[PDB]
Design a binder for this molecule. Structure first.
Ligand SMILES: *[C@@H]1O[C@H](CO)[C@@H](O[C@@H]2O[C@H](CO)[C@@H](O[C@@H]3O[C@H](CO[C@H]4O[C@H](CO)[C@@H](O)[C@H](O)[C@@H]4O)[C@@H](O)[C@H](O[C@H]4O[C@H](CO)[C@@H](O)[C@H](O)[C@@H]4O)[C@@H]3O)[C@H](O)[C@H]2NC(C)=O)[C@H](O)[C@H]1NC(C)=O
Ligand SMILES: *[C@@H]1O[C@H](CO)[C@@H](O)[C@H](O)[C@H]1NC(C)=O
Ligand SMILES: *[C@@H]1O[C@H](CO)[C@@H](O)[C@H](O)[C@H]1NC(C)=O
Ligand SMILES: *[C@@H]1O[C@H](CO)[C@@H](O)[C@H](O)[C@H]1NC(C)=O
Ligand SMILES: *[C@@H]1O[C@H](CO)[C@@H](O)[C@H](O)[C@H]1NC(C)=O
Ligand SMILES: *[C@@H]1O[C@H](CO)[C@@H](O)[C@H](O)[C@H]1NC(C)=O
Ligand SMILES: *[C@@H]1O[C@H](CO)[C@@H](O)[C@H](O)[C@H]1NC(C)=O
Lengths: 325, 173, 119, 173, 173, 119, 119
C-alpha cells in the first residue's frame, strides 16, 4: 500500500485488514501451517489437579472399596446408609475383613454404582435353629472379632443345622437387592464343625430367576491368616416377587435390602484429593473446565464433559489470517 | 482464502488497526487518516462467535459408562470393551480434526469474502470517479477524497456532483 | 513489552539547536506512527507533529512549524525531533508517543525529556 | 464464502418471480416487464436436487441387531450394549448436525454464487453500454427496446451497434 | 459455490498446456503464443498435494482387535461384536464418502478460484488499457513488440506510454 | 388466504364519475401488481390498465387512456379506478387482478363489480 | 496411441508441385498444432511452417515464404503441404511434428517423407 506523494488534484483511498503482530498457527485443509491473527484452544490439556464436589455428591472412598462398603467392612462402617453421585475409589484401598471373591465383581460394582446409594433396611428374617452373628479373627471391629455388618454368618446350633426355608415378599413399590453368599470351607472337618453337614446347598430363588450354588471345600492361599473364601452373590426382587432363600448349609445370610434405583451415579478410580470448586466435569486426574469441546486428560469422565480425542492441540481460527510487514 | 484479497491484491495487513478488523486509509490534501468499517468487522465477529457458541459449551452429560482401564486379563469382554472405546476415540478424534480444519478453512474464506465485499462495495460506490490500482487502493480523481466528501463512504456517496473524468481519468499528457 | 526509551535531561544554551531522541523497542518500528507532545509546567499538553516511519511523512502543528523537524532512523529504530532557535518559551518537557496512525490515540508514551533552556 | 449478492447489492428478493429463481427486470420506453433466467435457476435446482437424491431415498437395511431396551438390571454386558448404542446415536447425531449445517452453508453459498455469476455475465455482456449502479440494475446508456432487452437476456448481445450511442451518453451527455 | 471461470466464462479448455495448469495465450503482430503461469499452478498444486498429505501414508496401527468372522452361531456376545463392527464400518464409510465429496468440491472451488484470481490479476494489471470480451480474453487496445505480453505475465506491466494510445483506441467515433 | 374484496353493485347516473375499489388482503400489497379487466355481457374480457403499488407506475390501454385513472392506497391496501364520463358503453363488470408484474398472468381475481350506467 | 502417419516416398520431377500428407490419429486434431521440418541429407533440421487446425492460422519461415503452403483437412484429420516449384535444393526429408502451440515443443514426429527431386 505505497501511497503516492499527495498531488493536490487526485489521490488515493486504500483498503486493509487487521494483522495483529505474531499471531497463531492453525491447520486448514489446504495448508497444515497457516498463521492467523487469533485462535482458541479446543482441547483441554490439563486439569486443576484435584476432584471437587459442588454440583455432584462426591463420596471419597478413602482406603475402602465400593463392594467392601456394600458388605460392611469395619474400616468402611462410616459409609452406612450413604448416598452419592460418584464413588471415588482410591488406589490405596484394601480389605481388612474375611477374604471374599465376587464371581461377577464387575457387574455387581457397576449395578451398585448405578443405583448410587447404600441405604439399608433391616428385615426380621426367620432364622430358626441356627446360630446368628458368626465372628472371625480376620475381621476386627472395635478390637473384637467381628464380621461384615450387612452379612449374617449362620452356623450350627447344638450340633444340628435344620434346613433353612424362609420367605420375604416385596410388598413395597421398589426393587430389593439382597446381598448374600456361600462360605467355602478349608476342610471337611471344618465344614462339619461349622454346618453339621458334609455338603451344603443354597437355592436363592424368586418368581423369575433362581440361583443354586454349591460350596467348594478345599485349601486356598492364606489372606489375613484365613485359608477360606466367601463368594458373594446378589438377588434383585421386583415388586410383587417373593425372595425364597432355602439352604442346608454354608449360607452367609442377608440382613435386608439395599434399595437400588436409577439415576446419575457412577464410580471412579482416582487418587486426586477432594477440594472445593464449582465444576461440572470430573476426570480421574481431577476436575476440568468443561468450556472446551474436547480434551486429552483422561477417557474416563463423569458429568457434562468434553469428548476425549487423541490430539494434543486443536486451534480453531478465532481471527483472520495474519499477513505482517 | 479463495477470494484473493487478504493474501492477494492487499500486499500486507495494517498493524495499528486497534478498533476494527477492516478499514479505510487515505492521503488527501488535508493529511492522512484512517477509519474502521464497523459492518464487515461486525459480520465477521458475528459468524466467528456463532461458531464459538456452537463449540464452547453444549457438553453432553455422560454419568455411567463402561470401564475403560483394566488391571487384569479376562478375554472376550475386555477386548470388546477396549475395541469399542478405541473405535469411539478414533471416530471422535477424526470428527474433531475434520471439524477444526473445515471451520478454519471457512473462517479464512469468510475473511477473504468480507474483504472482497468491502472492496467491491467501495468500487461500486465510486463508479467512474476512481480507478483501482491493483494494490487494493482507489485513485480518486476529483478533490477531497476522504476529508469532506469522503466521510460519506458509509453508504452516502453522491458520485454525481464529482463526475470529474476530465482531470486525469480520461486525459492525454 | 512496548517501550519508548527517551533521554532524561539535556542542558542546551539558548539560541542553539538540539536533536532529541526516542528509541523504540518491543514492536515493529515501521508499522506504528510516532508523535511528539510538549508540556510546559504552566500549560497543558501541546501536540507538535507526527511522523510515519514507513516513508517519512511529515505534518506538524501550525504553532510548531519552523521550530521542529521530525526524522526517523529505521536501522536503529529511533525517532528524532530537531529543535531550531531555542528560546525561553521552548523550555518544557517533551514526550514521544506511539499512536498507530495519524488520527489514532497515542498507545504508549516515552519517559519525557526535560529541556531547560537557560544560560 | 458469501459473494455478497443475495444480501449485498440486491437489497431484497422479488416476491412475484413465480417462475424461475433468478431473473432480469427492465425499464424501457415501451414499459416495464420482467422474466426469469432458466440456466442459473436450472443449475441451482440441479445441485439442490442432487443433494436431495443423495439424502432422500437411500437407506441401509439393518435386519437383526442387539437389544436396545432392557427390563432387568444385569451389569457388564447390558452396560456395554447401552454404551455402544449411545455411542452410535451420538456419532450419528453429530454426523446429521454437521451434514445439515454444511449442506445448508453450501446451498446458500451456491445460491449467492449463481446470482453473482449471472450478474457478472450480464456485466461482461455490456462492456461500455451499462454502468453498475450498485443496486443490481445497470444504467444502460442507449435506446434499448424489448428486442435488445431480450437479446441481453438471450446471449445474442451485439455490444457494437449501440457502442457509439452508449459512449456519448456515458461521458458527454 | 463455484466461481464462473473454469466451466463458465473460460469456454472450452485449451489442452496445449503440457507444463502448467493455468496460463496465457496471446495473438500479437509477432504471432500467436502460449505461456504458463507458475504461481497459480504452484498454489493449486500445493493445496492439492497438501490434501494428499493428509491421506497418503498416514495410517493408524491396530494390532489386536476383536474377532470379525464367526464359524459358529452364538448369542449376545457374537451379536454385539457383529453390531459393533458393522457400526464402525458404516461410520467410517460415511466419513470416507463425506470427506471425498467435500475435498472434491473444495478442489473444484479452488481451481475455479485460482483461474478467476489470475483473470482478476490480469484485469487489474491492464487498468483501462484492455477490455473484457466475456470469452476470457483481453482485447488490449495498444500494439506492442511482445515485451508487453512478457511484462503482463510476470507482473511488471505499467500503463507506460500505452495509456493515451489505449484510451484513444478505446474511445473513438 | 389471499382475497381481493370488491363492492357488489354501484348505481351511477350517466355522465358522472365513479371511484371503484378493490381491497387487497392476505398478501404484501407492495410486492404484487394490480390490474383491471372489463367484461361486457356481449363482449369478451378487455384489459384496461396496470398499477405498481410500490411507486404508482401507470400504463393504460389505448382505448382507456382518457377513461380510467389508477391509484392505490398503501395504508388501507386498496386500489382505485377513477372512471370519468360514464356512458352507456361503460356498463360492464369490472375485475381487479393480482399478477406479480406487468408481463405475468393474473394470479387471483376479484369478485366483479357490476356498474349499470342507467337512469 | 498417438502417431503421425505419412506417405512413404514420392518421386516428383523437377519444376513440379507436390502435396505431402501427414495423417493424424490418436488425438484431437484441432487442439494441437502441426509443424513441418525439412532435413537435408548433409545439413540439419530446418523449420518451415506451423498451422493451427482450429482456424488455419499460417506463419512460415522467412526463407520458405513462397515455397510452402500449409493446409489442413479437419474431416480426414490430415495436414497437407503444397510445395511449389521444386528444385535440386528441395530434395530432402520432410517431417511433420505435433505441438501444443507455436512455442510449445514438437511432441511427436512423423515417419518422414523422402522427396527425391530428380529427372
Ligand atoms: C496345603 O498347602 C497349603 C499351601 O499353600 C498350606 O497352606 C499353608 O500352610 C502353612 C502352615 O499352616 C501356613 O503357614 C502359617 O502361616 C501363618 C501366617 O504367617 C504370617 O504371620 C506370621 C505371624 O503369625 C508371620 O511370622 C509370617 O511371616 C506371616 O506374615 C503363621 O502364623 C503360621 O505359624 C504357625 O506355625 C508356626 C510353626 O511353623 C508356629 O510357630 C506359629 O506359632 C503358628 O502356630 C504358619 O507359619 C501358610 O500360611 C499356608 N499358606 C500358604 C500360602 O503357604 C496348607 O497348610 C496345606 N494343607 C495341608 C493339609 O497340607
Ligand atoms: C512475537 O514476535 C515478536 C517479533 O515479531 C517478538 O518481539 C515477540 O516476543 C513474539 N512473541 C512471543 C510471545 O514470543
Ligand atoms: C485407612 O484409613 C483410615 C482413615 O482414613 C486411616 O486412619 C488408616 O491409617 C488407613 N490405613 C492405612 C493402612 O493407612
Ligand atoms: C418362623 O418359623 C417358625 C417355624 O417353626 C414358625 O413357627 C414361626 O411362626 C415363623 N415366624 C415368622 C415371623 O415367620
Ligand atoms: C445379631 O447382631 C445384630 C446386630 O447387627 C442384632 O440386631 C441381633 O439381635 C443379633 N442376633 C443375635 C441372635 O444375637
Ligand atoms: C434469442 O436466441 C434464440 C436462440 O439463441 C433465437 O430465437 C434468437 O437468436 C434470439 N431471439 C430474440 C427474439 O432475440
Ligand atoms: C519478468 O519476470 C522475470 C522473472 O521470471 C524477470 O526476468 C523480470 O522480472 C521480468 N522480465 C523483464 C525482461 O523485466
Amino acid at each position: 500500500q505505497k501511497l503516492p506523494g499527495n498531488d493536490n488534484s487526485t489521490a488515493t483511498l486504500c483498503l486493509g485488514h487487521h494483522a495483529v503482530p505474531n499471531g497463531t498457527i492453525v491447520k486448514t485443509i489446504c495448508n497444515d501451517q497457516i498463521e492467523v491473527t487469533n485462535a482458541t484452544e479446543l482441547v483441554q490439556n490439563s486439569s486443576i489437579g484435584e476432584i471437587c464436589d459442588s454440583p455432584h455428591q462426591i463420596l471419597d472412598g478413602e482406603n475402602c472399596t465400593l463392594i467392601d462398603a456394600l458388605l460392611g467392612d469395619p474400616q468402611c462402617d462410616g459409609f452406612q446408609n450413604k448416598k452419592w453421585d460418584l464413588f471415588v475409589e482410591r488406589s490405596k484401598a484394601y480389605s481388612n475383613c474375611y477374604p471374599y471373591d465376587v464371581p461377577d465383581y464387575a457387574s455387581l460394582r457397576s449395578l451398585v454404582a448405578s443405583s448410587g446409594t447404600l441405604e439399608f433396611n433391616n428385615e426380621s428374617f426367620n432364622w430358626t435353629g441356627v446360630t446368628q452373628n458368626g465372628t472371625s479373627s480376620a475381621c476386627i471391629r472395635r478390637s473384637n472379632n467381628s464380621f461384615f455388618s450387612r452379612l449374617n454368618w449362620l452356623t450350627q446350633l447344638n450340633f444340628k443345622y435344620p434346613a433353612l426355608n424362609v420367605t420375604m415378599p416385596n410388598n413395597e413399590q421398589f426393587d430389593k437387592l439382597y446381598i448374600w453368599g456361600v462360605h467355602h470351607p478349608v476342610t471337611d472337618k471344618d465344614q462339619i464343625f461349622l454346618y453339621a453337614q458334609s455338603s451344603g446347598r443354597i437355592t436363592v430363588s424368586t418368581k423369575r430367576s433362581q440361583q443354586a450354588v454349591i460350596p467348594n471345600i478345599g485349601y486356598r492361599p492364606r489372606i489375613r491368616n484365613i485359608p477360606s473364601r466367601i463368594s458373594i452373590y446378589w438377588t434383585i426382587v421386583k415388586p410383587g416377587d417373593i425372595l425364597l432363600i432355602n439352604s442346608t448349609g454354608n449360607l452367609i445370610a442377608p440382613r435386608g435390602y439395599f434399595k437400588i434405583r436409577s439415576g446419575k451415579s457412577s464410580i471412579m478410580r482416582s487418587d486426586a484429593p477432594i477440594g472445593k470448586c464449582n465444576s461440572e466435569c470430573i476426570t480421574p486426574n481431577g476436575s476440568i473446565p468443561n468450556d472446551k469441546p474436547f480434551q486429552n486428560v483422561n477417557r474416563i469422565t463423569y458429568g457434562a464433559c468434553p469428548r476425549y480425542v487423541k490430539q494434543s492441540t486443536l486451534k480453531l481460527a478465532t481471527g483472520m489470517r495474519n499477513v505482517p510487514e | 482464502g479463495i477470494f484473493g484479497a487478504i493474501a492477494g491484491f492487499i500486499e500486507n495487513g495494517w498493524e495499528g488497526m486497534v478498533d476494527g478488523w477492516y478499514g479505510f486509509r487515505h492521503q488527501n490534501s488535508e493529511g492522512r487518516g484512517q477509519a474502521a468499517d464497523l459492518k464487515s468487522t461486525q459480520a465477521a465477529i458475528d459468524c466467528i462467535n456463532g461458531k464459538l457458541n456452537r463449540l464452547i459449551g453444549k457438553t453432553n452429560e455422560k454419568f455411567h459408562q463402561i470401564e475403560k482401564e483394566f488391571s487384569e486379563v479376562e478375554g472376550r469382554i475386555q477386548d470388546l470393551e477396549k475395541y469399542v472405546e478405541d473405535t469411539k476415540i478414533d471416530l471422535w478424534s477424526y470428527n474433531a480434526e475434520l471439524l477444526v480444519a473445515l471451520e478454519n478453512q471457512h473462517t479464512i474464506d469468510l475473511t477473504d469474502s468480507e474483504m472482497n465485499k468491502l472492496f467491491e462495495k467501495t468500487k461500486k460506490q465510486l463508479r467512474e470517479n476512481a480507478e483501482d490500482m491493483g494494490n487494493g487502493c482507489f485513485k480518486i480523481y476529483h478533490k477531497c477524497d476522504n476529508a469532506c466528501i469522503g466521510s460519506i463512504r458509509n453508504g452516502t456517496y453522491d458520485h454525481d456532483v464529482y463526475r470529474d473524468e476530465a482531470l486525469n481519468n480520461r486525459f492525454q499528457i | 513489552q512496548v517501550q519508548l526509551q527517551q533521554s532524561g535531561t539535556d542542558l542546551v544554551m539558548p539560541g542553539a539547536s538540539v536533536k532529541l531522541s526516542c528509541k523504540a523497542s518491543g514492536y515493529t518500528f515501521i508499522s506504528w506512527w510516532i508523535h511528539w507532545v510538549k508540556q510546559r509546567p504552566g500549560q497543558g499538553l501541546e501536540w507538535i507533529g507526527e511522523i510515519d516511519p514507513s516513508d517519512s511523512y511529515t505534518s506538524y502543528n501550525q504553532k510548531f512549524k519552523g521550530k521542529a523537524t521530525l526524522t526517523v532512523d529505521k536501522s536503529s529504530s529511533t525517532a528524532y525531533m530537531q529543535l531550531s532557535s531555542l528560546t525561553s518559551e521552548d523550555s518544557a518537557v517533551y514526550y514521544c508517543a506511539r499512536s498507530g496512525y495519524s488520527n489514532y490515540p497515542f498507545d504508549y508514551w516515552g519517559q519525557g525529556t526535560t529541556l531547560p533552556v537557560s544560560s
